[PDB]
Amino acid sequence: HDFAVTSSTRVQIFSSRTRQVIKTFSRFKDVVYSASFRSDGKLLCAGDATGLVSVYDSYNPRTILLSINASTHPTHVTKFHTQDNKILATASDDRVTRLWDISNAYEPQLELTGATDYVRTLSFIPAAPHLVATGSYDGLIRLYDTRSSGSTPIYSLNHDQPVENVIAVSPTQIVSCGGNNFKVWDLTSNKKLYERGNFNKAVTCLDYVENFDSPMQSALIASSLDGHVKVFDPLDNFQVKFGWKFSGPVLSCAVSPSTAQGNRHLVAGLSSGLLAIRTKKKKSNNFQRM
Amino acid sequence: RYANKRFRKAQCPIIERLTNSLMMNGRNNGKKLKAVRIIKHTLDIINVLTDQNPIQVVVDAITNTGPREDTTRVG
Amino acid sequence: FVKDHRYPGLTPGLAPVGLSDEEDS
Amino acid sequence: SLVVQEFQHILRLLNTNVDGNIKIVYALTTIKGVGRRYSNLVCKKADVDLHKRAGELTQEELERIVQIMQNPTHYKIPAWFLNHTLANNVESKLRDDLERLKKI
Amino acid sequence: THKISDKYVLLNCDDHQGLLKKMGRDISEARPDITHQCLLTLLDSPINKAGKLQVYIQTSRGILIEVNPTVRIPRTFKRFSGLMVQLLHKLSIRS
Amino acid sequence: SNDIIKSGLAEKALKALILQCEENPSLKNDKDIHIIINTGKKMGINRDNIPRIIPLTKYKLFKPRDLNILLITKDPSALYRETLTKDEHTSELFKEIISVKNLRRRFKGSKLTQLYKDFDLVVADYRVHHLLPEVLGSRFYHGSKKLPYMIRMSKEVKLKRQQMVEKCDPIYVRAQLRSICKNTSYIPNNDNCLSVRVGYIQKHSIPEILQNIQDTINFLTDKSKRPQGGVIKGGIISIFVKTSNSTSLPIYQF
Amino acid sequence: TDRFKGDDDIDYYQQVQRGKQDKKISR
Amino acid sequence: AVPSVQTFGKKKSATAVAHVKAGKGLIKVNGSPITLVEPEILRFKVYEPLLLVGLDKFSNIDIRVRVTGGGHVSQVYAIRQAIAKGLVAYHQKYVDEQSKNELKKAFTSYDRTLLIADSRRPEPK
Amino acid sequence: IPTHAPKYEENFNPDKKSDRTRSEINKMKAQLKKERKFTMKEIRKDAK
RNA sequence: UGACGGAGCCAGCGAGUCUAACCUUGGCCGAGAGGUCUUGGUAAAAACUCCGUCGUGCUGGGGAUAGAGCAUUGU
């Protein structure tokens, strides 16, 4: 349960035991944007500002298994499909998201369109492997069924502010942040259940973790630009439990996964260049026969 | 020994034959441990990318790439 | 003075050390 | 939403063109007359990270590195880190020996 | 290319009838101007400038010549003949 | 001694040698100043290719940053190399740190010759200094220009019937290397003649060279400072200042 | 570059030295 | 005097000598454990006499192998031959003939060069 | 695509060699080698 | 079809009291022959495995030797 951190032109793998960097990926020609692991943790995908998607071995920066020319525009999102280990979803400034097979990466397996501005987040619904959610700066979260044509979404959800991030907290509920608030929606009802505007500045990142050893069973971590990272309880109507204030605008946040079986980290990445990690620690035989 | 008899080479394992063909092209003549290492990493890459048994991928590749009809020049 | 019983040449070959030598400069 | 972060493709340092894609140590090495150890010592003196690229370098750090490279005495870098008429006469002698041996 | 007396020259229909008759080869078979004008046409065609064209020359004596698309063949047959002589004897021509 | 320093004949010889070195291109190739000491009686100590350090109180011949330095170590080389590289005191001090086994494996013959071309100063562990003549070759050892010195790096003392623990002390290492660079050296021989480098032509002034000569005379002729000093027996009959190619110019004629 | 342009056409030193020398000669 | 057996294995200039005596399970090659036999890429050639028959056949014996000559490949083949032959000989001398025959059948079915030396002598035509 | 002019010599002779003083000196070394080899062979034949 | 360091690790032939460079700066001893010392310049298992680091391309890679231009450093 190590963690990957993306800065300008560099991806660093930090060890969870020592909180020190153990691996460094510095092959990228321009600024690298998103780095992610497979579900099995064997491959690491990174997206570049030149439109490249480079898939490395997770613990070997020397060997590059795959290099995809996904776009001419910068690719801001690279994610692996959670249900399927063969699918890589990339979202770029072409306003087109592309599903690739890892085996044959010469053409996109599927192209999802219908976004008018800057898709910079996507997510996979846990129970349904056919569903893909894309969040864009026009404010619409578009759900695509990959078994269909996929050029047009099956439905869309209107988060009025430009959507910074989308996450799926259950098979039915998703949470989208953009603007000062975040909104949690039901997918079957296509209606928002809750919205929390607890922040001053725009909510940048979301994380969700459940069944980890805690009094509270599920937790939603929301990081905004006012330096605040706050915890919300999905069982308690997404109310507010705890918060941290940092020295500057927090672009990214993460919490160590549920099966950490060791030290637990809350990690924040600020716009100033700082990375803040806060941790929770975890006679002889004759005499014996006598 | 697989060169003593005409069809003895069919009894050779096919991964061994792939390694022996990887020792070709001159610069690495005889570097069989290097070729075995290349096969090991190749099978790891195949299994990682395809989530299959890489021996089966090798077998399918050989059976597909074996040509079934050919030509010969006639004087 | 130093002595190594294995190596007799250490006593002539040793460079003299001084406080100016053990100084940051 | 306003996010302001705190790069040049080509850098002209000490009348030498360097690329911002390479690291600071790589750029100082590509600058002629400077070895890898000298570049590492210069980077350590200027306190710039060796892993940092040349494009993402502070202007004050670049000025300090330029001053250190310009003044080796002020930088106090060690010198250890700083680092055929005869054939024509032979042909004439061969000709003379050939003549004398042919006479012999 | 053939050696006269000493000058190496590319064999010509017009300028080397005596040499062709002495060697016994017919004079009508010595036509490098066709290859010259075909090279001019191919390399000046817009597909070459678009970069979608490659040219190989297969001589009657069995020599195979690869033509880089960026070469500029001289427009005059005299300079073409000199270039072909140096190419056939040195095996390559640089820029 | 004091008369040797205060004699104007020695100073006039020094200007004469400097002017001759400037005028003559063959002498202009040379750059070092040697004195040739005529000991009165035979020294009686066999040469062992071990340089013995003569202190220079007034001035320093060289700084350790100026020279190119090769360190040759005993060969669990990881501890010594890593300590000297990581520690800031000795980080830039050594141009190259190598073990004796790695040196034998890497450098052979002409590669050894270009090594001699590259490196100006060679120092080594005293435990491998005796193994060095076969590894470095003879063309290091002939002429005594770049004979490897003996440094002790751990500061521990070997005791009989017990092991000696291996550490590396960078402060002790830089202290010994500073002493070696600032001080001149001699190697004893059996006969009467001795040769000691006293100054460098470009980097030293004439009074500095004369003071170095005076200090060398006092250290060698002094009855104390045994066994590094006190090796001259019967006094000094005559000293002869000369470079590598220049003829000997006599001073302190007795 | 070319657009149908066609290919372009073609003191003390000597005293001590002489003292050593004539000392050897005298011997 | 414990029950002990000495056997030999050859491949080119390499020669391995195996002493198989009554013991507890120590399998050592050149005074070092069998799990450090180099190269890594060829360690399973040394392992396969153990793995074909089972570690239970090795539960009550001690094998000590001393190898000289040859190179890495030759030495690996000499080791595995000596170990297989030493197993067969110990199970024939101090364990049953049925155990010996079953071991010989397993080793012969996998690779006869574990048991019989592979001699590549010239054949003039 | 770019266009590059070929580098060729008019009146090319493969037999003839292609600064100038150094080339003359090198031709003189070649002549010295031929003469030395020929004289060596002649001297050996006379000796036999 | 790499380079650069570290570490790990494996041969078989070969045993005549016989095996082995040149010039050079000087000091001293000696009637000499020479001896001794000093100086300086030239001749003369690998693989393989493992770990780390650089990085792969007409995006020519090198080698000069002169000259020019502009500046460092400057009486």
PDB file of all heavy atoms in Angstrom, chain A residues 23 27 29 62 64, chain J residues 52-56:
ATOM      1  N   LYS A  23      10.740   4.867  -5.211  1.00  0.00           N
ATOM      2  CA  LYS A  23      10.875   4.795  -6.665  1.00  0.00           C
ATOM      3  C   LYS A  23      10.616   6.154  -7.295  1.00  0.00           C
ATOM      4  O   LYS A  23       9.882   6.975  -6.748  1.00  0.00           O
ATOM      5  CB  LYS A  23       9.934   3.762  -7.294  1.00  0.00           C
ATOM      6  CG  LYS A  23      10.128   2.348  -6.802  1.00  0.00           C
ATOM      7  CD  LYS A  23      11.121   1.608  -7.669  1.00  0.00           C
ATOM      8  CE  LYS A  23      11.493   0.266  -7.068  1.00  0.00           C
ATOM      9  NZ  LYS A  23      12.808   0.307  -6.379  1.00  0.00           N
ATOM     10  N   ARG A  27      10.849   9.794 -16.795  1.00  0.00           N
ATOM     11  CA  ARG A  27      11.100   9.672 -18.225  1.00  0.00           C
ATOM     12  C   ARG A  27      10.264  10.655 -19.032  1.00  0.00           C
ATOM     13  O   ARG A  27      10.485  10.822 -20.236  1.00  0.00           O
ATOM     14  CB  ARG A  27      10.800   8.247 -18.672  1.00  0.00           C
ATOM     15  CG  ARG A  27      11.925   7.254 -18.490  1.00  0.00           C
ATOM     16  CD  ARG A  27      13.179   7.661 -19.247  1.00  0.00           C
ATOM     17  NE  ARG A  27      14.058   6.520 -19.477  1.00  0.00           N
ATOM     18  CZ  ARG A  27      13.814   5.536 -20.333  1.00  0.00           C
ATOM     19  NH1 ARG A  27      12.756   5.553 -21.129  1.00  0.00           N
ATOM     20  NH2 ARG A  27      14.659   4.515 -20.408  1.00  0.00           N
ATOM     21  N   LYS A  29       8.573  13.640 -20.944  1.00  0.00           N
ATOM     22  CA  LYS A  29       9.171  14.785 -21.622  1.00  0.00           C
ATOM     23  C   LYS A  29       8.551  16.095 -21.162  1.00  0.00           C
ATOM     24  O   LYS A  29       9.253  17.100 -21.009  1.00  0.00           O
ATOM     25  CB  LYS A  29       9.023  14.629 -23.131  1.00  0.00           C
ATOM     26  CG  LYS A  29       9.824  13.482 -23.709  1.00  0.00           C
ATOM     27  CD  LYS A  29       9.677  13.414 -25.216  1.00  0.00           C
ATOM     28  CE  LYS A  29      10.417  12.216 -25.781  1.00  0.00           C
ATOM     29  NZ  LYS A  29      11.890  12.361 -25.629  1.00  0.00           N
ATOM     30  N   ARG A  62      12.522   1.575 -15.152  1.00  0.00           N
ATOM     31  CA  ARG A  62      13.363   1.435 -16.335  1.00  0.00           C
ATOM     32  C   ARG A  62      12.597   0.826 -17.503  1.00  0.00           C
ATOM     33  O   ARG A  62      12.868   1.148 -18.665  1.00  0.00           O
ATOM     34  CB  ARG A  62      14.593   0.595 -16.005  1.00  0.00           C
ATOM     35  CG  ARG A  62      15.331   1.067 -14.772  1.00  0.00           C
ATOM     36  CD  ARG A  62      15.795   2.498 -14.949  1.00  0.00           C
ATOM     37  NE  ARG A  62      16.886   2.842 -14.049  1.00  0.00           N
ATOM     38  CZ  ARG A  62      17.507   4.013 -14.044  1.00  0.00           C
ATOM     39  NH1 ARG A  62      17.165   4.980 -14.879  1.00  0.00           N
ATOM     40  NH2 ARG A  62      18.494   4.221 -13.178  1.00  0.00           N
ATOM     41  N   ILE A  64       9.335   0.130 -19.807  1.00  0.00           N
ATOM     42  CA  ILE A  64       8.069   0.705 -20.246  1.00  0.00           C
ATOM     43  C   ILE A  64       7.342  -0.348 -21.064  1.00  0.00           C
ATOM     44  O   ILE A  64       7.713  -0.613 -22.213  1.00  0.00           O
ATOM     45  CB  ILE A  64       8.273   1.985 -21.080  1.00  0.00           C
ATOM     46  CG1 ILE A  64       9.191   2.998 -20.394  1.00  0.00           C
ATOM     47  CG2 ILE A  64       6.944   2.648 -21.363  1.00  0.00           C
ATOM     48  CD1 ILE A  64      10.675   2.900 -20.742  1.00  0.00           C
TER      49      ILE A  64
ATOM     50  P     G J  52      18.301  -2.192  -8.790  1.00  0.00           P
ATOM     51  OP1   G J  52      17.100  -1.707  -8.070  1.00  0.00           O
ATOM     52  OP2   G J  52      18.152  -2.813 -10.125  1.00  0.00           O
ATOM     53  O5'   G J  52      19.320  -0.976  -8.929  1.00  0.00           O
ATOM     54  C5'   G J  52      19.619  -0.154  -7.812  1.00  0.00           C
ATOM     55  C4'   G J  52      20.813   0.734  -8.059  1.00  0.00           C
ATOM     56  O4'   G J  52      21.960  -0.055  -8.462  1.00  0.00           O
ATOM     57  C3'   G J  52      20.684   1.764  -9.165  1.00  0.00           C
ATOM     58  O3'   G J  52      19.929   2.896  -8.780  1.00  0.00           O
ATOM     59  C2'   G J  52      22.139   2.085  -9.474  1.00  0.00           C
ATOM     60  O2'   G J  52      22.675   2.959  -8.493  1.00  0.00           O
ATOM     61  C1'   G J  52      22.794   0.717  -9.301  1.00  0.00           C
ATOM     62  N9    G J  52      22.970   0.025 -10.590  1.00  0.00           N
ATOM     63  C8    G J  52      22.217  -0.994 -11.114  1.00  0.00           C
ATOM     64  N7    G J  52      22.639  -1.384 -12.284  1.00  0.00           N
ATOM     65  C5    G J  52      23.732  -0.574 -12.548  1.00  0.00           C
ATOM     66  C6    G J  52      24.599  -0.532 -13.663  1.00  0.00           C
ATOM     67  O6    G J  52      24.571  -1.225 -14.678  1.00  0.00           O
ATOM     68  N1    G J  52      25.574   0.441 -13.519  1.00  0.00           N
ATOM     69  C2    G J  52      25.702   1.268 -12.434  1.00  0.00           C
ATOM     70  N2    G J  52      26.711   2.147 -12.477  1.00  0.00           N
ATOM     71  N3    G J  52      24.902   1.241 -11.387  1.00  0.00           N
ATOM     72  C4    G J  52      23.947   0.302 -11.511  1.00  0.00           C
ATOM     73  P     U J  53      19.050   3.682  -9.868  1.00  0.00           P
ATOM     74  OP1   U J  53      18.260   4.712  -9.154  1.00  0.00           O
ATOM     75  OP2   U J  53      18.357   2.681 -10.714  1.00  0.00           O
ATOM     76  O5'   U J  53      20.126   4.426 -10.773  1.00  0.00           O
ATOM     77  C5'   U J  53      20.905   5.491 -10.250  1.00  0.00           C
ATOM     78  C4'   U J  53      21.975   5.917 -11.220  1.00  0.00           C
ATOM     79  O4'   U J  53      22.864   4.801 -11.488  1.00  0.00           O
ATOM     80  C3'   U J  53      21.495   6.331 -12.599  1.00  0.00           C
ATOM     81  O3'   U J  53      20.977   7.647 -12.650  1.00  0.00           O
ATOM     82  C2'   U J  53      22.735   6.123 -13.454  1.00  0.00           C
ATOM     83  O2'   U J  53      23.655   7.186 -13.263  1.00  0.00           O
ATOM     84  C1'   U J  53      23.323   4.862 -12.822  1.00  0.00           C
ATOM     85  N1    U J  53      22.903   3.633 -13.538  1.00  0.00           N
ATOM     86  C2    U J  53      23.620   3.283 -14.662  1.00  0.00           C
ATOM     87  O2    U J  53      24.566   3.927 -15.071  1.00  0.00           O
ATOM     88  N3    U J  53      23.198   2.147 -15.295  1.00  0.00           N
ATOM     89  C4    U J  53      22.148   1.339 -14.928  1.00  0.00           C
ATOM     90  O4    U J  53      21.890   0.343 -15.598  1.00  0.00           O
ATOM     91  C5    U J  53      21.453   1.762 -13.757  1.00  0.00           C
ATOM     92  C6    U J  53      21.846   2.864 -13.119  1.00  0.00           C
ATOM     93  P     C J  54      19.815   8.001 -13.702  1.00  0.00           P
ATOM     94  OP1   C J  54      19.233   9.308 -13.316  1.00  0.00           O
ATOM     95  OP2   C J  54      18.936   6.814 -13.835  1.00  0.00           O
ATOM     96  O5'   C J  54      20.587   8.190 -15.080  1.00  0.00           O
ATOM     97  C5'   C J  54      21.510   9.254 -15.245  1.00  0.00           C
ATOM     98  C4'   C J  54      22.445   9.022 -16.405  1.00  0.00           C
ATOM     99  O4'   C J  54      23.020   7.692 -16.329  1.00  0.00           O
ATOM    100  C3'   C J  54      21.829   9.065 -17.792  1.00  0.00           C
ATOM    101  O3'   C J  54      21.591  10.378 -18.261  1.00  0.00           O
ATOM    102  C2'   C J  54      22.850   8.295 -18.620  1.00  0.00           C
ATOM    103  O2'   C J  54      23.974   9.110 -18.912  1.00  0.00           O
ATOM    104  C1'   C J  54      23.283   7.211 -17.631  1.00  0.00           C
ATOM    105  N1    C J  54      22.555   5.937 -17.842  1.00  0.00           N
ATOM    106  C2    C J  54      23.041   5.049 -18.805  1.00  0.00           C
ATOM    107  O2    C J  54      24.058   5.349 -19.445  1.00  0.00           O
ATOM    108  N3    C J  54      22.399   3.880 -19.017  1.00  0.00           N
ATOM    109  C4    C J  54      21.309   3.587 -18.315  1.00  0.00           C
ATOM    110  N4    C J  54      20.705   2.425 -18.553  1.00  0.00           N
ATOM    111  C5    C J  54      20.787   4.466 -17.329  1.00  0.00           C
ATOM    112  C6    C J  54      21.435   5.615 -17.126  1.00  0.00           C
ATOM    113  P     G J  55      20.112  10.812 -18.715  1.00  0.00           P
ATOM    114  OP1   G J  55      20.120  12.266 -19.005  1.00  0.00           O
ATOM    115  OP2   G J  55      19.162  10.273 -17.709  1.00  0.00           O
ATOM    116  O5'   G J  55      19.881  10.033 -20.086  1.00  0.00           O
ATOM    117  C5'   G J  55      20.711  10.278 -21.214  1.00  0.00           C
ATOM    118  C4'   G J  55      20.851   9.045 -22.070  1.00  0.00           C
ATOM    119  O4'   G J  55      21.035   7.894 -21.216  1.00  0.00           O
ATOM    120  C3'   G J  55      19.649   8.689 -22.931  1.00  0.00           C
ATOM    121  O3'   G J  55      19.651   9.395 -24.161  1.00  0.00           O
ATOM    122  C2'   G J  55      19.786   7.181 -23.104  1.00  0.00           C
ATOM    123  O2'   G J  55      20.723   6.881 -24.125  1.00  0.00           O
ATOM    124  C1'   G J  55      20.399   6.767 -21.768  1.00  0.00           C
ATOM    125  N9    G J  55      19.409   6.269 -20.796  1.00  0.00           N
ATOM    126  C8    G J  55      18.771   7.004 -19.830  1.00  0.00           C
ATOM    127  N7    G J  55      17.964   6.290 -19.098  1.00  0.00           N
ATOM    128  C5    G J  55      18.087   5.007 -19.606  1.00  0.00           C
ATOM    129  C6    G J  55      17.454   3.806 -19.211  1.00  0.00           C
ATOM    130  O6    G J  55      16.629   3.638 -18.309  1.00  0.00           O
ATOM    131  N1    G J  55      17.854   2.731 -19.991  1.00  0.00           N
ATOM    132  C2    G J  55      18.755   2.803 -21.018  1.00  0.00           C
ATOM    133  N2    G J  55      19.017   1.650 -21.649  1.00  0.00           N
ATOM    134  N3    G J  55      19.360   3.918 -21.397  1.00  0.00           N
ATOM    135  C4    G J  55      18.978   4.974 -20.651  1.00  0.00           C
ATOM    136  P     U J  56      18.373   9.354 -25.130  1.00  0.00           P
ATOM    137  OP1   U J  56      18.363  10.603 -25.931  1.00  0.00           O
ATOM    138  OP2   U J  56      17.194   9.000 -24.301  1.00  0.00           O
ATOM    139  O5'   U J  56      18.669   8.143 -26.124  1.00  0.00           O
ATOM    140  C5'   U J  56      19.823   8.136 -26.960  1.00  0.00           C
ATOM    141  C4'   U J  56      20.145   6.746 -27.451  1.00  0.00           C
ATOM    142  O4'   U J  56      19.786   5.786 -26.419  1.00  0.00           O
ATOM    143  C3'   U J  56      19.402   6.306 -28.710  1.00  0.00           C
ATOM    144  O3'   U J  56      20.228   5.414 -29.457  1.00  0.00           O
ATOM    145  C2'   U J  56      18.223   5.527 -28.143  1.00  0.00           C
ATOM    146  O2'   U J  56      17.660   4.586 -29.030  1.00  0.00           O
ATOM    147  C1'   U J  56      18.863   4.850 -26.940  1.00  0.00           C
ATOM    148  N1    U J  56      17.915   4.493 -25.878  1.00  0.00           N
ATOM    149  C2    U J  56      17.714   3.154 -25.629  1.00  0.00           C
ATOM    150  O2    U J  56      18.286   2.277 -26.249  1.00  0.00           O
ATOM    151  N3    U J  56      16.821   2.879 -24.629  1.00  0.00           N
ATOM    152  C4    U J  56      16.122   3.793 -23.869  1.00  0.00           C
ATOM    153  O4    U J  56      15.347   3.392 -22.999  1.00  0.00           O
ATOM    154  C5    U J  56      16.384   5.159 -24.190  1.00  0.00           C
ATOM    155  C6    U J  56      17.250   5.454 -25.161  1.00  0.00           C
TER     156        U J  56
END
